Amino acid sequence: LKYICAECSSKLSLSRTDAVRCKDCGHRILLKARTKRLVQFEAR
């Protein structure tokens, strides 16, 4: 799947057997991207 770096606006798509680090950055803090399947909210 795809991930996103922490301290820069990037969009990594490196799956397994890759992980760290980032593309044109150097830091190893990677967050996972939001799901495609939309979640509803009872606006209450």
Partner 1 sequence: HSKRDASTPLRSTENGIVDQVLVTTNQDGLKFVKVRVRTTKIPQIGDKF
Partner 2 sequence: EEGPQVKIREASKDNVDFILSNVDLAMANSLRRVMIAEIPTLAIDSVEVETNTTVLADEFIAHRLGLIPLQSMDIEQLEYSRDCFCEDHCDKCSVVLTLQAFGESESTTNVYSKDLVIVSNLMGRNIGHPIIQDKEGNGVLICKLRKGQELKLTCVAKKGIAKEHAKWGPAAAIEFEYDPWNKLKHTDYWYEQDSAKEWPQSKNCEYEDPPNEGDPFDYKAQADTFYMNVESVGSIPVDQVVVRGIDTLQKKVASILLALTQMDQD
Partner 3 sequence: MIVPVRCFSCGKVVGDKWESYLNLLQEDELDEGTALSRLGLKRYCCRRMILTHVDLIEKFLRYNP
Amino acid, res. 16:
R
The answer to whether residue 11 forms part of the interface with partner 1 (CB under 8 A) is no
d(CA 23, CA 39) in angstroms, rounded, equals 30
Amino acid, res. 25:
C
Out of 1, 3, 6, 17, the residue judged to bind partner 3 by CB under 8 A: 6
Out of 7, 8, 11, 19, the residue judged to bind partner 1 by CB under 8 A: 19
d(CA 40, CA 44) in angstroms, rounded, equals 12
The answer to whether residue 28 forms part of the interface with partner 3 (CB under 8 A) is no
Residues 18 to 37: which contact partner 2 by CB under 8 A? 34
